[PDB]
UniProtKB/Swiss-Prot annotation, chains A, B:
Protein name per UniProt: Penicillin V acylase
Annotated source species: Pectobacterium atrosepticum (strain SCRI 1043 / ATCC BAA-672) (Erwinia carotovora subsp. atroseptica)
Gene Ontology CC terms, in alphabetical order: periplasmic space
Gene: pva
Enzyme Commission code(s) on record: 3.5.1.11
Uses described in the biotechnology field: PaPVA exhibits high recombinant protein yield, better pH and thermo-stability, and greater specific activity for penicillin V than other PVAs from Gram-positive bacteria, actinomycetes, fungi and yeast, suggesting that it could be a potential candidate for industrial production of 6-APA, a chemical compound used as an intermediate in the synthesis of beta-lactam antibiotics.
Length: 347, 347
């Protein structure tokens, strides 16, 4: 997976987050509207963390019809906080067992928890630093193992953060400068990957392979060097709306450039996989775009057009069908249908 | 600017052509249905070539509302012949002036002529070899005086050809092996660009810039090494339809990978420009897909659902609006509206 936040110097206060989901198999992803005040359980042990959602969200699920595997993978809430769970990471989660004072939170609900409770990256980082819970993952049927993952976050202010578990310890990097994040290697290592390429130009050469390092490097270069709203001699400066749209096109093109062609696989490197879909978050407009790479399907969801007030514990679901082939076009909030929140995987 | 034909070894007799259009400005592109038996003139000048179309086509136009610079840039006809006019080429067209038999054909109509008259690449190559006409251009004053292109072709049989004008002479390369074609450098040079990268693995390294050479190399690699219909015994072997769809997804992902991010420009290399849109041709199903890179818009046109019988010299047009922002979804033949064929640029 690849994620970035794109910031146009010529169109400030208009951040756009984009992400690719990379996995070798169908993720059976659908979209969900989750209203305010849902009562949720962490899905861990007898000491599972508990909360009541404060903010409504639109999210992208994976395997939501399977008790064993259902998760929130990606989403944005009504305050503009976006969260992405990047798969095929190299995390080692805590050994320590959940206790009533420090209860468990399933990995499957990790992003949901954040989207449900916090309005900004900063807010979320402050709360996560207190280590109020233990992140847990399951023991599962063989062949193969599963997914390790880490969590990236972004704001309407353009802020960014990433949270990983290395040697069982929670490691947080928080800065508006952390515009690009890949699933691998660890973020400390990610931070040094550009240096060589900055020394020579990115216009001179870039690595082109699918490797996480290459995707990171490519995306870092384009995000810093592409301005679609440059002033041109003889051509009116564009209006705000046109500038916004151009930024959106730029973000889409970069995340497409960092995607992994469909069907590609390398036995030596099992952490490289087909990009199956992409999401793009326009924070200011609160618009959540979804794009299938498997089926022709691109559309968005306008959180301003959704009522996130409580619905007596029910929610809504946009069924994308097999291989995300069920076509929706334009603003799609109207096509969401009532449904009970799926259960998060855990124990 | 990038085109390829994708052939899946595990799903034979199902070729897919894909192309990216790269240009620094809005091309004001729309789609057009052109029925059988349109009477057409080569656009230049006293001695313009004349013909009556034998096959109907769906095509993508550029600047079709401007006398000076309307053209057919891309399309497929009812027999599965696809044609693409690749822009920012390094062609030098003939010096020789048009004479009544050998009359002139404007560059703007070059692809249309081929789509109108021939059913296969082979048929088209045989006719083009006879040099029945002189290709002409050169009508505007312009900000700076240069523009150029070459013509790539493909079949339902998976056959390929490219036609260029080098030192004023027509050069044709015709072979099912010519799966990938870029706008630059000349095709003779293109043919040698992979060798180095074949020697080392493409899984080992690929060049990752927007240079035509890099795009050619990346696309060549993915086209030969990606099989989305590999048996994985594990997951049921797929049905014909699912294999077809997977091939479609693969082709889309590869052309996206070879696209140029929107807003990117390099003063030293003016022949690199933003990808503005992509088309994909499914020859067997006769489906023509169009995808904007500027606006969210992806849909297709099913030639089996169109009646290509003569309409007393009229045609139909699918208006894509400013920046191709007018949204259509699914099979869009029904949204085409009657209109008179635009005039091809020339003299």
């Amino acid at each position: 997976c690849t994620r970035f936040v794109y910031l146009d110097p010529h169109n400030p206060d208009y951040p756009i987050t984009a992400r690719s989901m990379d996995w070798a198999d169908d993720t059976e992803t659908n979209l969900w509207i989750f209203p305010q005040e849902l009562k949720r359980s962490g899905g861990a042990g007898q000491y599972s963390l508990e909360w009541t959602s404060k903010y409504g969200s639109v999210i992208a699920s994976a395997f939501d019809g399977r008790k064993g595997m259902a998760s929130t993978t990606d989403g944005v809430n009504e305050k503009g906080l976006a969260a992405n769970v990047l798969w095929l990471a190299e995390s080692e989660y805590p050994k320590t067992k959940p206790t009533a004072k420090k209860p468990g939170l399933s990995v499957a609900a990790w992003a949901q928890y954040v989207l449900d409770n916090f309005a900004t990256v900063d807010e979320a980082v402050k709360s996560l630093q207190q280590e109020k819970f233990i992140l847990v993952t399951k023991q599962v049927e063989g062949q193969k193992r599963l997914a390790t993952l880490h969590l990236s976050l972004s704001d309407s202010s353009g802020d960014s953060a990433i949270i990983e578990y290395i040697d069982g310890k929670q490691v947080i990097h928080h800065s508006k400068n952390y515009q690009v994040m890949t699933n691998s290697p660890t973020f400390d290592q990610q931070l040094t990957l550009n240096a060589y390429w900055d020394q020579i130009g990115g216009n001179v050469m870039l690595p082109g392979t699918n490797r996480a390092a290459d995707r990171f490097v490519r995306a870092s270069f384009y995000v810093k060097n592409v301005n679609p709203n440059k002033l041109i001699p003889g051509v009116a400066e564009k209006g705000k709306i046109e500038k916004d749209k151009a930024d959106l096109a730029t973000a889409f093109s970069i995340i497409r450039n960092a995607s992994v062609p469909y069907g590609y696989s390398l036995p030596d490197m099992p952490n490289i996989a087909s990009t199956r879909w992409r999401t793009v978050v326009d924070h200011k407009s609160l618009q959540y775009f979804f794009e299938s790479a498997v089926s022709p399907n691109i559309f968005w969801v306008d959180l301003k057009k959704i009522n996130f007030a409580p619905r007596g514990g029910s929610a809504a679901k946009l069924d994308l069908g097999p291989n995300q082939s069920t076509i929706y076009s334009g603003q799609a909030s109207g096509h969401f249908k009532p449904a009970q929140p799926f259960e998060f995987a855990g124990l």
